[PDB]
């Protein structure tokens, strides 16, 4: 009967993970942040797509504004709505409406406009849309360790990259011999990370694979 003491002590460790993973859900179930990184990544592509002409279009201020049809597009995604926060907070509720129309117009423009890049209808959006949550979680994960690893002395994990690397690596089922929690605590939450990152990162590659069958 002594084992119940030793065996139940394990249950505790096995228990935390139940939350670390449960919490990971409450961080990817937001129809928002998910749908916001997507519309911010598609534009970063334009941030180097159209705003990357030689040092002769990068000097003519007149020509960037000249394309008043792109300026609104190459602005943010939600960093327009982000502002809406510092507005509604200042009771400028009147101005809120106008900015709401701007996001409405922007989603119709980009949404439909982008969908004009033929050869894939409704097949290419389900992708990124999904790629979102998938990545978000990994982030959350890397952040998890980040907190419990950055401060540690001799801990191979330092920058958000190094902690981010470990995330992808352990979530892509890859894992090397460079990124690994020093404090058993990191190793702990890690069990959760991968328990999550994997399952998700897999649903990702699942469609990546299928789609790849073209």
């Amino acid at each position, epitope marked *: 009967h002594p084992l119940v003491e030793l065996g139940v002590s394990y249950a505790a460790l096995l228990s935390v993970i139940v939350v670390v993973v449960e919490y990971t859900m409450q961080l990817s179930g937001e129809y928002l942040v998910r749908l916001y990184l997507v519309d911010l990544i598609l534009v970063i592509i334009l941030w180097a797509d159209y705003a990357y002409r030689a040092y002769k279009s990068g000097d003519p201020a007149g020509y960037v504004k000249k394309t008043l049809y792109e300026i609104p597009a190459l602005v943010p995604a939600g960093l327009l709505a982000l502002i809406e*926060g510092h507005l*509604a*907070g200042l*009771g*400028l*509720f*009147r101005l*809120v*409406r106008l900015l709401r129309f701007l996001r409405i117009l922007l989603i119709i423009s980009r949404g439909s406009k982008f969908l004009s890049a033929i050869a894939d209808a409704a097949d290419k959006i389900r992708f990124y849309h999904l790629f979102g949550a998938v990545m978000l979680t990994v982030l959350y994960g890397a952040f998890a360790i980040y907190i419990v690893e950055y401060p540690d002395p001799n801990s191979s994990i330092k920058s958000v990259f190094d902690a981010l690397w470990w995330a992808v690596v352990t979530a892509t089922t890859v894992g090397y011999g460079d990124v690994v929690p020093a404090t058993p605590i990191g190793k702990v939450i890690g069990i959760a990370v991968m328990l999550t990152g994997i399952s998700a990162l897999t649903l990702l590659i699942g469609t990546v694979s299928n789609m790849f069958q073209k």
Partner: antibody
Amino acid sequence: DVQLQESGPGLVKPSQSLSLTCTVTGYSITNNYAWNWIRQFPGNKLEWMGYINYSGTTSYNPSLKSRISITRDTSKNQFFLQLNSVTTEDTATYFCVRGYDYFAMDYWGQGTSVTV
Amino acid sequence: QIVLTQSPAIMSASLGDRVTMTCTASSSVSSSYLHWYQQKPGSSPKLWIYSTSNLASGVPARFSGSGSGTSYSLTISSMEAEDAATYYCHQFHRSLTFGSGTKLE
């Protein structure tokens, strides 16, 4: 033609949480403006507790925060006031109001008396 | 955060006289976020003067508001049997607050 319709208990024992319910008609809690919970003490004074808004986000009175929170019934069109550990000081009247432009409750509910 | 002082806390006068009130904020404000509410004891509060210089829909033109920086007023021109109400003035700088109420008798 809008109109807030407040209702609620009105008597509880200390350390017990207060749960208020205010309905809204002729409008929506998601369109625009903010939604407040400003009480009126026995001293006829007025103390603003907090607010949820058209979007959802909320903010409270810097003092009460440590002991309160608020929500809403997105579907039925109502918001909820929640105060934890109601002492004697909390004895007062309660009101829910439409926070119009630059913050200015432009529509007040009739009222409810809460005793502690 | 800041505090409000609605003097007189209580005051009188009668039909005809240009009634006056004053909201003295311990600290500066913002001509916008300054509003006046009228409350008839027993009933429910009712916004009366918004954004310093413009009034509510169901308000008689007899009213007028004057303020800036640290002080604002709710001046009138003539009272009635109705005006007998507790007028409040709230502001919004750091957070939200209200006043003692320039009670009318």
